[PDB]
Design a binder for this molecule. Sequence first.
Ligand SMILES: *[C@@H]1O[C@H](CO)[C@@H](O[C@@H]2O[C@H](CO)[C@@H](O)[C@H](O)[C@H]2NC(C)=O)[C@H](O)[C@H]1NC(C)=O
Ligand SMILES: *[C@@H]1O[C@H](CO)[C@@H](O)[C@H](O)[C@H]1NC(C)=O
Lengths: 584, 193
Amino acid sequence: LTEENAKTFLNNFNQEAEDLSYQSSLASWNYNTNITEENAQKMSEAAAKWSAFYEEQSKTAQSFSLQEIQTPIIKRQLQALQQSGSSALSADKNKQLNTILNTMSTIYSTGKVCNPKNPQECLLLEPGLDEIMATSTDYNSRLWAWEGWRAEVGKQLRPLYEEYVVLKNEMARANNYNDYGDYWRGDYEAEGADGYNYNRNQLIEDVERTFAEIKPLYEHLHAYVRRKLMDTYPSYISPTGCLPAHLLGDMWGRFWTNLYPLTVPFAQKPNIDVTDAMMNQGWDAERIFQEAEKFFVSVGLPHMTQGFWANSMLTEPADGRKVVCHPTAWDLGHGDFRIKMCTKVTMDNFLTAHHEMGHIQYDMAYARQPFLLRNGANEGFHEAVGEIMSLSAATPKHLKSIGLLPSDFQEDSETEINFLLKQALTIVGTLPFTYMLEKWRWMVFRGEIPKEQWMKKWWEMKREIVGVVEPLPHDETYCDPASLFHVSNDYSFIRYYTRTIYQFQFQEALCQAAKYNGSLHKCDISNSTEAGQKLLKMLSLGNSEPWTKALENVVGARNMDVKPLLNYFQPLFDWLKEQNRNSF
Amino acid sequence: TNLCPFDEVFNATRFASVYAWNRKRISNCVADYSVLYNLAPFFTFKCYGVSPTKLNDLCFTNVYADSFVIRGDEVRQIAPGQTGNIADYNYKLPDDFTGCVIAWNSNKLDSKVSGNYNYLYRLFRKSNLKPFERDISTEIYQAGNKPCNGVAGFNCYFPLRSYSFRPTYGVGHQPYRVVVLSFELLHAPATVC
Ligand SMILES: *[C@@H]1O[C@H](CO)[C@@H](O[C@@H]2O[C@H](CO)[C@@H](O)[C@H](O)[C@H]2NC(C)=O)[C@H](O)[C@H]1NC(C)=O
Ligand SMILES: *[C@@H]1O[C@H](CO)[C@@H](O)[C@H](O)[C@H]1NC(C)=O
């Protein structure tokens, strides 16, 4: 009944959902720290209660009408409650829905990978030793250790997903949508006034200018890695063929633990030695997080709560309390703000602790927003904000005043170039991969035809786009987008794409706000109170205000801007330019 | 010398819910405000209306010391003439309030493990609560046209929700035991001094 009933219903939903979500999060934390399958049972029952309550409130939300009455953020909150996902519909139709989710997650562990029928060097699936036993730059070990992995996963995944996508798109008949592909990208719909209306097809028109006109610039970099590979060992790039993609070393695109030393031809300048200065001085898990908090409060962000240190579990367990090793920043309802990272002290643990503390700082900004808007303004903002501080805390200028590195080390020319090469190769090359994967996903979500004629066209397009192909084809046995953590449970991929652009835009804005001379990389968010408030005025907004207007109000930007990303390297680009003059 | 009951009203084992707060009338007692702030340096004795010094030589009439347990921000909500969710429906103070508030951080007393639901507040009152009114009623709140008949659900909300205090909430939604002093000047001989 108008806004008078809507406000009361929304307040009731907020009050109940806050407690239920806190209980669910507490059960999940207890399970993740004390896995005994009894914590699993209680977590399952708490999640079932939360899901049932949320479904009931969402059914009430659809029962409400939202034609034109709700002008304020009540409209946004009711829309967020109205997005019900795969639910509703007739009982006969949705009865079989519960028989799909249970078996969806069981298909990943069905594949065992080790030496075929050989007790020697056979081990189960564990992330601890895979990262050290899989990355091997060899011409023979990459054949069956990879083709078998790709083939034995999607043995019958395609003939099931063929009807899975059809039945999931049939759900779009009763949610005022058109395509399951448009379902993901439609979350950006946000209008603020007359003349600023947001089109449903904004993405399909604003992506050509941001990617296609600057594609050759990100292609010369791909030519740079070709010349380095040949020098290490010949016969890595066929004069008539194409370089194999299965022996690149890593399809995850995280880091190169073997090719980094063999990158600079001179290999004479020393590399960083952070762990040597952390082990002796007494830097541990209890203190790295304190240093990150000191860095965050030196900008203006508030200190962590007293309970944050009280219940955090920053160290290994004591009595058989196995934990899923993954750095996750936890909210826990009423501002508990726990953090889970069971790791020792290394080079990357410090920086990922800074990134997780950035996640927690972003979380400690919208605790005043309504429960339905206590999220990031966009899918890509929440990770990008943490990654901004993660990358900003890695500069030697930051690790020279604290005391981690000696003060007698004057900055060098090629050393900073070498440092920026790894960070400009680990994530910048990921954007083309994410773009092609997302466009392929969008095109295959239509499901307009089975693969009896599109097979040749898809591979021809793939060859003419990037120019990498398997030496030999395969039968109907494999499926590419299956062997990955964030595609196994049907997640999105724009989150990992827009995050880079957003983080670079925010970094450019903050370094502009820093008002510091010198170079464009020595600028740091630390000891900049004005930059601190300029970041906080965006963090403490949530979903109450549209992300477009949020980005506008800070510095002024209609959409994504890759110009800050390019200008991050434009002042120092002649070094790469002078080494690309030997090609036509 | 008869010391005033500010011991058995402060050190009480359990306080009263906000929707039904216990108003304790005390008179003929000497008020030793000095002994109040001798438990940890984390009091929030931000005093309104009168001077921070209580003027222990200034005599009042009977003071209404009523105590309840609320969250952290709702302590800020309790103020002489400020709106919100708990200063409108549960405990409203007059604009000419004489006296002031005392709020603790009671996390080791009534933050029961796995949550305690003995603390209930009043949501959805539909009418601003006149100052110093209790309204201890259990009647499901009706907003829509449909007359509720003792069954809650859509448009029929139970107006007494629960804090569900438990540890680990933090500096925010944790039990802050609040007792406020209402110094009244209504003729009569002056006894509280
Ligand atoms: C982890 O959870 C268990 C129960 O979920 C807690 O209780 C332990 O396990 C069983 C309970 O059925 C009993 O043997 C004891 O109550 C506990 N056993 C031991 C060896 O402690 C257990 O306390 C929890 N652990 C932590 C660290 O919180
Ligand atoms: C309440 O109990 C404490 C605990 O010993 C005591 O120190 C204090 O005098 C008592 N009375 C108060 C705070 O009025």
